[PDB]
Design an enzyme around this catalytic site. Sequence first.
Site, PDB file in Angstrom:
ATOM      1  N   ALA A 305       0.978  -1.169  -0.090  1.00 41.26           N
ATOM      2  CA  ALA A 305       0.019   0.002  -0.016  1.00 41.26           C
ATOM      3  C   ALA A 305       0.821   1.205   0.070  1.00 41.26           C
ATOM      4  CB  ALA A 305      -1.175  -0.087   1.158  1.00 41.26           C
ATOM      5  N   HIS A 334      10.654   7.975  -0.569  1.00 42.63           N
ATOM      6  CA  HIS A 334       9.328   8.178  -1.052  1.00 42.63           C
ATOM      7  C   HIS A 334       7.975   8.521  -0.352  1.00 42.63           C
ATOM      8  CE1 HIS A 334       6.452   6.406  -4.531  1.00 42.63           C
ATOM      9  NE2 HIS A 334       6.358   7.712  -4.358  1.00 42.63           N
ATOM     10  N   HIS A 338       5.889  11.894   0.198  1.00 44.36           N
ATOM     11  CA  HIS A 338       4.326  11.857  -0.215  1.00 44.36           C
ATOM     12  C   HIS A 338       3.695  12.127   1.028  1.00 44.36           C
ATOM     13  CE1 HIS A 338       1.187   9.168  -2.352  1.00 44.36           C
ATOM     14  NE2 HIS A 338       1.093  10.478  -2.675  1.00 44.36           N
ATOM     15  N   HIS A 464      -2.071  -3.531  -9.187  1.00 43.50           N
ATOM     16  CA  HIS A 464      -2.611  -2.053  -9.656  1.00 43.50           C
ATOM     17  C   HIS A 464      -3.718  -2.611 -10.777  1.00 43.50           C
ATOM     18  CE1 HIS A 464       0.263   0.667  -7.965  1.00 43.50           C
ATOM     19  NE2 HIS A 464       1.166  -0.347  -8.181  1.00 43.50           N
TER      20      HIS A 464
END
Lengths: 522, 65, 53
Positions: A305, A334, A338, A464
């Site tokens: 996730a 990352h 975010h 995805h």
Amino acid sequence: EYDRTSQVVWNEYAEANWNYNTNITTETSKILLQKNMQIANHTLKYGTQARKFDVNQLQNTTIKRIIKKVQDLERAALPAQELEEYNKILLDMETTYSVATVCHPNGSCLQLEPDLTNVMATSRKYEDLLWAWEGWRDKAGRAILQFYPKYVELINQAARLNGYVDAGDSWRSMYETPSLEQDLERLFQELQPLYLNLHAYVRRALHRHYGAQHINLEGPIPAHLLGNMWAQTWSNIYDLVVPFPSAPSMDTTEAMLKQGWTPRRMFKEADDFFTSLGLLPVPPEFWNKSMLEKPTDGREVVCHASAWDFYNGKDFRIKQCTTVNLEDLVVAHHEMGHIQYFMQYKDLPVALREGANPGFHEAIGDVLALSVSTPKHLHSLNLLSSEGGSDEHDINFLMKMALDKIAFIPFSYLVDQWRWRVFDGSITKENYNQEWWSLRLKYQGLCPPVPRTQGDFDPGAKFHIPSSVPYIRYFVSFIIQFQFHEALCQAAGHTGPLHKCDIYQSKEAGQRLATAMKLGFS
Amino acid sequence: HDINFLMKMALDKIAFIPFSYLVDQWRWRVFDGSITKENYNQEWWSLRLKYQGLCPPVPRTQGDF
Amino acid sequence: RPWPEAMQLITGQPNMSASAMLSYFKPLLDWLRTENELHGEKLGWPQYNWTPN
Ligand SMILES: *[C@@H]1O[C@H](CO)[C@@H](O[C@@H]2O[C@H](CO)[C@@H](O)[C@H](O)[C@H]2NC(C)=O)[C@H](O)[C@H]1NC(C)=O
Ligand SMILES: *[C@@H]1O[C@H](CO)[C@@H](O)[C@H](O)[C@H]1NC(C)=O
Ligand SMILES: *[C@@H]1O[C@H](CO)[C@@H](O)[C@H](O)[C@H]1NC(C)=O
């Protein structure tokens, strides 16, 4: 009124999502289910209220943008039966994919995220890699295929009642770009030469290792002889494609073992670097309220996730836990980026709390990871690398870093190209798999290791695909993040070897980043 | 007799409907720049397999046209 | 004059209709479907990645 009610309802939704993610049980599943029903009801009611309004005759920008963004009901435009069936299909696909495990019937079994990905990323045997890839693709794709046409039909229906055309325009309207497809095709064509050279070298190395029986000089490399279940970022383990083995080449496998290097202190290091860049820090309760380590039981999280924000202005947690690794650092940076992107537009209304462009999220998340991965920053942090002194170390580092962020561009284009072609009715059900391999033979250089007949929904392996997320938002990021770095390295006052430039205590660069990323979707 | 005559004329005409739809579709895609030059034969054979359901009896490499 | 006017002149509808072919081949279509189900075969080509050699 929309802001006031949406703040609390979305805070509840995100709290339920966290409770599911960290405490997977039956009670959490039921709570998420009926709160999903509640949020669907609320969004349908408020969208219907907004549809009585008009946006064109209104004379303003912010409220006009809010009304336009809330005009669509997304998946709540379906009738009761259709919406219920669509949500049930999505939940069933996600459940049958997350728990999907393929194994030898002898008794020993392996799960996707903990072992199978690792079990091929560390293995160098043709038969074992082939068995793993074939078994996973077979099981997951065959399980998903039973529901996927229904989901495609229902999402096309939802888009058509929303006002779009077959769910392709719906996902392409997030960018507000009428000429998005042509622009992305042009970008891929521009990137074609370097990627082709890289693929030629990779095929050379693979033929050198495996011989000529399996991989020959002329012909695409098989899709399972690269390192990943899906070869999105192939040969991230580059030991078989090392240009020249050099003495000062970094290891970055023992530099985080003999110093302890718990995930907590490494996340603290990432936050310290981000603060040194010159942006506001994360509130301290993140550290003592969130989870970022391995659990005490066998049930921890979903397979994979992203960061979670509760839209309440206080909770900015991170879910990812990947033990201890070098790639752990890049994913942690990352997620730091975010979460800070999620945090920076707190003052903006919750209707615009979505980011400038879904690509920009990953772009700003990964630009700092790109800047910190340089050998100079690693030399300034726990490591002793050649930095830019020796050009051989520089080219080795460039090869390691371009095995990622390149050979991912074709995959990030291909997945959503195929999904657009199937959503807009161009691809009939009867060859759902075939086009997916044809694209694999056109945009990328991969071929099926075993003849993949129809009935094997090979697009069902990617997480995805059944989770209904627009993969192309990564492609833009992997094209745009570099374009970010350049600009940031401009503020450093020097350009020189831009492939080794680093951002560290560049206050003006951080100020420039914040003066624009704060705008959000407004 | 009716079945035999119908089968003969079906072989004549409805085995040609797909090729007629196929070749001009491929040419339309080629002219509009969507096929470039690196893969002229691959798109043609993929279209053959999609519409007419025929396969290359031998591996047709790039450079054969 | 444009094509639809002529197409209506021969037949009566200014549209390209494929129902004429279907009605033309209806006996063969029915017989062939019956023979196919009798012989137990599947339509299509669900082994698309196949080549004789
Ligand atoms: C029309 O847009 C303007 C900005 O162009 C809005 O002005 C601000 O709007 C924000 C919310 O978007 C409010 O929090 C601020 O208080 C507003 N500024 C002022 C000085 O009042 C304006 O509100 C928009 N019009 C309407 C009716 O909302
Ligand atoms: C997690 O779920 C278990 C199920 O037994 C429950 O006992 C526990 O209280 C839950 N944790 C929290 C923090 O609510
Ligand atoms: C949603 O609203 C409708 C309005 O008719 C109502 O019948 C239904 O019970 C509501 N659902 C929930 C979960 O509150």
